[PDB]
Every structure is written in structure tokens, then in C-alpha cells.
């Protein structure tokens, strides 16, 4: 029931020979795994933690100047010198001013002038980095037991969370009553934390590209620097003003916090106050359902009366969830649940909370099932007092096919070349598709890095037009496909 009520649900159906399935886990998403003899499980990536961050650069977003000094030299005497030019905590500039008898000079020319001021940082943004071995993905595996944890906390069940680290990427959950599940994850491929910086700025943290971070035009410290006083690009945070040729001056350029916020658009925000927590990204895992068994398959039908205690509702995914209570004898019984037609001649829908059972009489169990599009009837119980529930599913099968194609394409857009692993059961077609996607995505990312979505749409339109106005059919079709894919990615790029 944890995975219900989340609009980004994914249904992964089927395990291969070996009883394993490849599932990508995303933070905002959730995965419901359906296997034939296995119970239905819900997998959610609820946390990614980076530990032991190391700073590589401390940028200055707000500074001040305190000790301004000037040296002036008469024309043809060369540029002047201040003793504080050697000082790395001072920012200096060389200019020229008009000189002559009026200035106490005696030569009437452009006399070089140098002005220096002490650069002091008042606000900085850290750029901590983390080693890929220090990530820790937390995952919650919850099965469709149809039951609840129960408020009585003296016993706490149904809450198995597994931590996955690059060192320990294989772990098993012990779901009570359902055996155990094995997750064979690959954290080292989910995110390249050697090309990412945990940018923290005034109680707000972002995850950013490392080259982008190193390219920022603000003054920076090495990161091990413990006293400031050696800022590198101090000239980017100051301005030297020589109106006409009378005097030279230097002033600071105000807090760069808002300009940084503008620069950070397109960077995913993370948390860095109580640990470095990243609620973004994906995990590729292999699900080992071999030692996963349905609970209570030795039980018998209830042969009793059920009452609906939570009225049937339709989730955002085309399934229906209902909560029924059993009022009969033989408490540990399988619940007779069918999605038939009006005459009950055909089975039209397949339930999702597979093998719904009653463990205690006074313990409601909520069933999730997938009805067909249109009229359908939910039948619960057996002939005496059997409760028959009607339902109408408003969609269309063609509409569902379109929605699933759209969802698959969107997954490809986000997890490019990793979308081939979301539900893959091995196979040769999946491998060929993934290899082709890797080869094509290498070129696409090379040719489209650092381009805004508007530029992507423009380039897609241009390429589509070029392909349309192409004599060669072999070139025209390829160009049109490239243009349409570019247009799609540009229309669904910013996230």
C-alpha cells in the first residue's frame, strides 16, 4: 500500500529464468513488482547519502575592501609600485592619469598610477566533493500484504529498509512471512560523483557539475585554505573606476548570492544541513525473487461474509483499491476475489494484491486490483451473502498503450541507455537496444551538451527541415528521426 497514491508508480511484471529482474529505482518514483508465483512488492529509493565530503573550492559571493592605497609616477618614469602588490590579500590595478605642473610633476603626460585594496570575504559557498565509495542508498521494500503495520508499536512489522553501499551492493531483505528478497544493486553507475560537487551556499545546497563549478567567475580558495587571504580571482568581485584620468578607485561588486541563485537554474537542490542527503537520481538493481514465496498459500477459501469498510476507490494508475473486512469462521483464509463480468462468465481483471488472505477476523484487508476498461464487477466472497461490486473504468486500451509509450519514452529521456534496464529480463534484443542507445547517446550528449531547451527545439526544427528537403531517402529518414527526437528531448528536457 506504500506504493499506491504515488503518480510516478511503475509496474514491473515478470522475472526471467533465475527469478531475477532488472529495475531502476528513482527517488520520486516507486516500483511495484509483479511475478507469477511471487507476491507483489513495492520498491522505493527513499534516500541517498554522501558521507565525508571534502571541499575542493570555497568561492566568495560577498567581499569588502578596507585598506586602499595609491602610488603615482610621472610620465616616462615607468609604472609605479606599491609594496602591497606582492600581497595576495590585496587586489591591485595599474592605470594612467594626466600629469603636469598642476600635479607637481613637471612633464605633462600620462603618469602611470597603481591602486590597491585589501580583499576580505564576508560570505562564501563551499564546493564539497564526495568519493563515489561513500554513497549510501536507502531502499524500502514493502509487500502487498493487504494489511497495515498496526498502531500498537510493541510489535513493528512491514517496514524493511535496506541500505546499499558501493562496497556492499548485494543485500537481502527478510520480509516476514514472504521469505527473503535479494537486491543486487550497482551504485557505482547511478551517478558519477567524480564529476559532481555538493555546492552549499547559506543553508541551501545544490548538486552541480564539477567543470561548471570550477568555471565559476567568482574568487575562490583552494579548499584546504584555512585563513582566506589568498583569493584567486579577486578581480571578478571588484571594479576599478578611472573616470576621465583624474583618479583611480576600486569598489566591491555587492553580494553575488542572487546572481548565484540565477546561475544555479537547472541544478537539482539537495540537503546538506544534517548530512548530505540527495533526494534525486536513480539506482539500478537486480531483484532476486527466487527465495520469495507467497504467504498463506496453504490456506482455504473463507466461505464467509465480507463487508466493505473502505469504499472502492480508483488510483491514478487505472487500478482499484478496496478495503474489506471478514465476518465469518476460519480466520486464516484466502479471500475469494474475482473481477468478472455482469453474468460472471469471464474473468476480466487481474488483482494486484496477489493472494489476499485474512489473518485475523477483526482485521480489515485492503485489496488492489486492475479492472478492465469499461464495465466490470468486483466479486468478494462466496454464494451466501457474496458482495458484488460494480465499477466502470473510463479509459481506453489505445489510450493506455499511448500512455505507456509516452512513459517509456520519458524514462529513456531521463535514464538514457539505463531505461533498457528498468524491467529487462536479460535477452538479446534488450542488449542490442541498450548498446545502440549507448552509442547514439554518446554522440547526442557530445553534440548537445550545454544547450538550453530553446536551442534544442531550434536545432531539432532545423534538422527536421533539412531531412525533409533531402533528395536521398536514406538520409531524409535518418535526419527526420534525429530532428523529431531532438524536438521531443527539447520539449521534455528541463526538469
Amino acid at each position: 500500500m506504500r506504493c499506491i497514491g504515488i503518480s510516478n508508480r511503475d509496474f514491473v511484471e515478470g522475472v526471467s529464468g533465475g527469478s531475477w529482474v532488472d529495475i531502476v529505482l528513482e527517488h520520486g518514483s516507486c516500483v511495484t513488482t509483479m511475478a507469477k508465483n511471487k507476491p507483489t512488492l513495492d520498491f522505493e529509493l527513499i534516500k541517498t547519502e554522501a558521507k565525508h565530503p571534502a571541499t575542493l573550492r570555497k568561492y566568495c559571493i560577498e567581499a569588502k575592501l578596507t585598506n586602499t592605497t595609491t602610488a603615482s609616477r610621472c610620465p616616462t618614469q615607468g609604472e609605479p609600485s606599491l609594496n602591497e602588490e606582492q600581497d595576495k590579500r590585496f587586489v591591485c590595478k595599474h592605470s594612467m592619469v594626466d600629469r603636469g605642473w598642476g600635479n607637481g610633476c613637471g612633464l605633462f603626460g600620462k603618469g602611470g598610477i597603481v591602486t590597491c585594496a585589501m580583499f576580505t570575504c564576508k560570505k562564501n559557498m563551499e564546493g564539497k566533493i564526495v568519493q563515489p565509495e561513500n554513497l549510501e542508498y536507502t531502499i524500502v521494500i514493502t509487500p502487498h500484504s493487504g494489511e497495515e503495520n498496526a498502531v500498537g508499536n510493541d510489535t513493528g512489522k512491514h517496514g524493511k529498509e535496506i541500505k546499499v553501499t558501493p562496497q556492499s551492493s548485494i543485500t537481502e531483505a527478510e520480509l516476514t512471512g514472504y521469505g527473503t528478497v535479494t537486491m543486487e544493486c550497482s551504485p557505482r553507475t547511478g551517478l558519477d560523483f567524480n564529476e559532481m560537487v555538493l555546492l552549499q551556499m547559506e543553508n541551501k545546497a545544490w548538486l552541480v557539475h564539477r567543470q561548471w563549478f570550477l568555471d565559476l567567475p567568482l574568487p575562490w580558495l583552494p579548499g584546504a585554505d584555512t585563513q582566506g587571504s589568498n583569493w584567486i580571482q579577486k578581480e571578478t568581485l571588484v571594479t576599478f573606476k578611472n573616470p576621465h584620468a583624474k583618479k583611480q578607485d576600486v569598489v566591491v561588486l555587492g553580494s553575488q548570492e542572487g546572481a548565484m541563485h540565477t546561475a544555479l537554474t537547472g541544478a537539482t537542490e539537495i540537503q546538506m544541513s544534517s548530512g548530505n542527503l540527495l533526494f534525486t537520481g536513480h539506482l539500478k538493481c537486480r531483484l532476486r525473487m527466487d527465495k520469495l514465496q507467497l504467504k498463506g498459500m496453504s490456506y482455504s477459501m473463507c466461505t464467509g461474509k465480507f463487508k466493505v469498510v473502505k469504499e472502492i476507490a480508483e488510483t491514478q494508475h487505472g487500478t482499484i483499491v478496496i478495503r474489506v473486512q471478514y465476518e465469518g469462521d476460519g480466520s486464516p483464509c484466502k479471500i475469494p476475489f474475482e473481477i468478472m463480468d455482469l453474468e460472471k462468465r469471464h474473468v476480466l481483471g487481474r488483482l494486484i494484491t496477489v493472494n489476499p488472505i485474512v489473518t485475523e477476523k477483526d482485521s480489515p484487508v485492503n485489496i488492489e486490483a486492475e479492472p478492465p476498461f469499461g464495465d466490470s464487477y468486483i466479486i468478494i466472497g462466496v454464494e451466501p451473502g457474496q458482495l458484488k461490486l460494480s465499477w466502470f473504468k473510463k479509459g481506453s486500451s489505445i489510450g493506455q498503450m499511448f500512455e505507456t509509450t509516452m512513459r517509456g519514452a520519458k524514462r529513456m529521456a531521463i535514464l538514457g541507455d539505463t531505461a533498457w534496464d528498468f524491467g529487462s529480463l536479460g535477452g538479446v534484443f534488450t542488449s542490442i537496444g541498450k548498446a545502440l542507445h549507448q552509442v547514439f547517446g554518446a554522440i547526442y550528449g557530445a553534440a548537445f551538451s550545454g544547450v538550453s531547451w530553446t536551442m534544442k527545439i531550434l536545432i531539432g526544427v532545423v534538422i527536421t527541415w533539412i531531412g525533409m528537403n533531402s533528395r536521398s531517402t536514406s538520409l531524409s529518414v535518418s535526419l527526420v528521426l534525429v530532428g523529431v527526437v531532438t524536438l521531443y528531448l527539447g520539449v521534455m528536457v528541463q526538469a
Binding site: 497495515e148 498496526a150 498502531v151 500498537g152 510489535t155 469498510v309 473502505k310 477483526d362 480489515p364
Partner: protein, 109 residues
């Protein structure tokens, strides 16, 4: 904004007695954050029902909850002497706060 409940209620032992918790479209008419608390004298409130009808693990099955429109109801079927207590209704409102009923005193006699 306090949820409205009858000041008092009495029912003969072994009978069934119902309590009402009338609220607005935000507190008890808009959301299923309806909970019933039983408080014996000199003791902290005890969660009797939640999600309208669901009852805690230790809570007897004699306690049943219903909700209709802006009104949520609590029913007791056994009416044992131990059931005589003060019952409070609460709801999590649309603005993110918690509102409590005025509380009904149930007496068996």
C-alpha cells in the same frame, strides 16, 4: 472551529450507543483524518479509532467508526462498564492544524 459533540451520552450495558462529531468541510467533512480518543479520568487520551474507522491494534473490535458528509460517528456495541469514559473527536484540518471535539461523557447506567 472545535468539532461539535454531544455534551453527554448514556447507554444501558450490553447495548449499542453512537456519538456524533459534526465539523466543517475542512476538518471532518473534507478529509479522512478523523480520530476518536478515549480518556479515562486522570489518564492521557487513548487512540480508539483513526482514519474514521480503523482501530488501533489493542483497541477492541466493539468500536466502530463512520463518517457521513461533515459528520463522523463512533459506535460502541458491548457497552461494558470499562467503556464508560470521555470520548474526544479530532481531525487534521485543511490548514494543517488539529481540532478536537468538545468530548462526550459516556455513562452505562
Amino acid at each position: 472551529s472545535a468539532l461539535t459533540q454531544p455534551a453527554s451520552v448514556s447507554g444501558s450495558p450490553g447495548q449499542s450507543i453512537t456519538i456524533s462529531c459534526t465539523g466543517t468541510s475542512s476538518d471532518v467533512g473534507g478529509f479522512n483524518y478523523v480520530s476518536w480518543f478515549q480518556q479515562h479520568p486522570g489518564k492521557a487520551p487513548k487512540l480508539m479509532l483513526y482514519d474514521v474507522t480503523s482501530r488501533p491494534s489493542g483497541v477492541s473490535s466493539r468500536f466502530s467508526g463512520s463518517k457521513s458528509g461533515n459528520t463522523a460517528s463512533l459506535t460502541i456495541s458491548g457497552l461494558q462498564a470499562e467503556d464508560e469514559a470521555d470520548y474526544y473527536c479530532s481531525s487534521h484540518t485543511s490548514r494543517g492544524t488539529w481540532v478536537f471535539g468538545g468530548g462526550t461523557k459516556l455513562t452505562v447506567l
